[PDB]
């Protein structure tokens, strides 16, 4: 018995009405629970037996069943309700879980602040070279980083890491790393990070000249 959960993610405002659905592959009667998960925390029971509220769980949370379909509704979204939600059937063994739904908080557009970092002299001495581009406190999450080395477009030699939504201003930050051998690094002069984002009227470029203090 598989639990097909939709959607994978959604953004919403405090006070909103939120709807998460879960489709079971075959009949499971009412033996369905809904769980809330937050980074590095125990999952928490919200609703048991399709529609019953767990003691201590605020009466803004509700669940309903119609046939094979199960629905988790949050009547009026509160700040603490930002999390990932999973459905579960326990009709038979093995019990199975949905893929989850991440509920994120919508806010106004915010352009990133952009910073570029050369490889440190220390890293260069240890034998490697990493060039980094930081995109600080932006919304929405979608953002494009383009690396240029002496005006030549880079492809397939960079990796990105992105933070979860900030608990104070609801933004994202992003770290991009251009990976090059130390010998390759010294073959070129101007390193550039070009950033495209909805909050930017036109793409912003940060650059440095290799070796410049």
């Amino acid at each position: 018995i598989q639990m097909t959960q939709s959607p994978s993610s959604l953004s919403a405002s405090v006070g909103d009405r939120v709807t998460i659905t879960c489709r079971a592959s075959q009949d499971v009667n009412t033996a369905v629970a809904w769980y809330q998960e937050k980074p590095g925390k125990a999952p928490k029971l919200l609703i048991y037996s399709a529609s019953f509220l767990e003691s201590g769980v605020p009466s803004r949370f509700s669940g309903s069943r119609s046939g094979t379909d199960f629905t988790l509704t949050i009547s009026s979204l509160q700040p603490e309700d930002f999390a990932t939600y999973y459905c579960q059937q326990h009709y038979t063994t093995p019990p199975t879980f949905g893929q989850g739904t991440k509920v994120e908080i919508k806010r106004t557009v915010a352009a990133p602040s952009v910073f570029i970092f050369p490889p440190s002299d220390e890293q260069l001495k240890s034998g490697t070279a990493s060039v980094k581009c930081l995109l600080n406190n932006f919304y929405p999450r979608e953002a494009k980083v383009q690396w240029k080395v002496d005006n030549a477009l880079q492809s397939g030699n960079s990796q990105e890491s992105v933070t979860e939504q900030d608990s104070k201003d609801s933004t994202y930050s992003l770290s991009s790393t251009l990976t090059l051998s130390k010998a390759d690094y010294e073959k070129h002069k101007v390193y550039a990070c070009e950033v495209t984002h909805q909050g930017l009227s036109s793409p912003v470029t940060k650059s440095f000249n290799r070796g410049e203090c």
């Binding site: 928490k44 890293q123 240890s126």
Partner: protein, 214 residues
């Protein structure tokens, strides 16, 4: 207050064995079912096994049948998961729960890998000299080439927390992890304040403090 505490996780070789424990408080496990449930890095929740401590009856996911054994000792109010013939695929946070699953532990991390522990090098990400006067500057630390996860980073021994971003680790082509921690600070503080990242890699017993200078 019902509590469940997992222990026993850590780094082990493929084909090896590891025993997890689940210590229960605030209720008696004779009265319930105890489950193990796991979450692999980006895979979602997967039920592993269940036991009824009263009669010792067990059920297992097909993926672990035979090579895992769940057990319980009611006199210790503790359940166990004996894992054998471990595979890379078994790498996960393991949770125990009780019966819907109304209480869960915080989980314990199991990593199945042939790779050896390696402590990180820590490199400074110095604030740029073309940083705007009276504006905002960025600086950070690169915590490179460690295994396994996790690493923790603080700034100035915890006194600096505002404007810090410690990024999720990146798995490099080498099979070693790297991560950055950055912070934005007033430009006016660069020649007058000291900024130190405090890095902890507990799997290798590595503690490093790195001063980040302009």
């Amino acid at each position: 207050e019902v509590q469940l505490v997992e222990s026993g996780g850590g780094l082990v070789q493929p084909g090896g064995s590891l025993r997890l424990s689940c210590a229960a408080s605030g209720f008696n496990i004779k009265d319930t079912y105890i489950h193990w449930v796991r979450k692999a890095p980006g895979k979602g929740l997967e039920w592993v096994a269940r036991i009824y401590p009263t009669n010792g009856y067990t059920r297992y996911a097909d993926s672990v049948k035979g090579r895992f054994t769940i057990s319980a000792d009611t006199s210790k109010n503790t359940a166990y998961l004996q894992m054998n013939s471990l595979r890379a695929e078994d790498t996960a946070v393991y949770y125990c729960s009780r019966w819907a699953m109304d209480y869960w532990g915080q989980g314990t991390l199991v990593t199945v890998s042939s790779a050896s522990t390696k402590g990180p090098s820590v490199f400074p990400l110095a604030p740029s000299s073309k940083s705007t006067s009276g504006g905002t500057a960025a600086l950070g630390c690169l915590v490179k080439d460690y295994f396994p996860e996790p690493v923790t980073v603080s700034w100035n021994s915890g006194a600096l927390t505002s404007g810090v971003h410690t990024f999720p680790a990146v798995l490099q082509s080498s099979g070693l992890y790297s991560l950055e921690s950055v912070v934005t600070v007033p430009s006016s503080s660069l020649g007058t304040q000291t900024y130190i990242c405090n890095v902890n890699h507990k799997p290798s017993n590595t503690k490093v403090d790195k001063k980040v200078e302009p």
